[PDB]
């Protein structure tokens, strides 16, 4: 797989509440958020790859409510958002259950959902399918961790979940919805 450090900084908020993101040095970033709408912040790559290995270390992981410490990315053709969720806050991300995949010392549940009239890389009010791998139990944080994304791509394919042909961003993110928290993450 590719061996390139990060080149992309993502800082998205729909404007609800407070999302105080810091674009740190190298692969490092932090977020403190409060009473938010929908947001996603992270570091990664402008063009995703199905062969990338993402390394990270979350030195601070302190979400509440809906929060996700997750690989986040998109394809176009078709427009699909995907997620590999290693940890979360109060509520565990789920959807339509498809199966499981083992990767990087964890077992992940595979889900699909669909969003309507929602923000995406194509506009503020769009419809798109979402593919999820969600760890069955929260991954420990504070030590170096790996996501071998190809294992997820392959398992998704085995359940009829095919990604699009045009790769957009691919980041190791802090995402949340209607919540509050803190994170500090370094990505490579």
Author numbering: -2 to 185
How did the manuscript describe this experimental structure?
Fentanyl is a potent agonist of the μ-opioid receptor (MOR), with an affinity of approximately 1 nM and a potency 100-times that of morphine. Custom-designed ligand-binding proteins offer the possibility of both detecting and counteracting toxins such as fentanyl. Following the placement of the hydrated fentanyl into the binding pocket via PatchDock, RosettaDesign introduced 9 mutations to the Fen49 scaffold to optimize the protein–ligand interactions. Fen49 was designed to bind a solvated fentanyl.
We solved an atomic resolution (1.00 Å) X-ray crystal structure of Fen49 in the apo state, one of the first examples of an original (non-optimized) computational design that has been structurally characterized. The structure reveals a highly preorganized binding cavity (28 of 30 non-alanine/non-glycine side chains within ~8Å of fentanyl adopt the designed rotamer) and an overall structure in very close agreement with the design model; the r.m.s.d. of the design model to the parent structure is 0.26 over 184 of 185 residues (TM_align score of 0.99). The Fen49 apo crystals were obtained from a condition containing 25% polyethylene glycol (PEG) 3350 as the precipitant. During model building, a well-ordered portion of PEG was observed in the binding cavity. Soaking experiments with fentanyl tended to crack the crystals and destroy X-ray diffraction, likely as a result of PEG being displaced from the binding cavity. This, coupled with a lack of alternate crystal forms, prevented us from obtaining a structure of the parent Fen49-fentanyl complex. The Tyr80–chloride interaction observed in Fen49* is mimicked by a Tyr80-PEG hydrogen bond in the Fen49 parent structure. Purified Fen49 displayed an affinity of 6.9 μM for a fentanyl-Alexa-488 conjugate by fluorescence polarization.
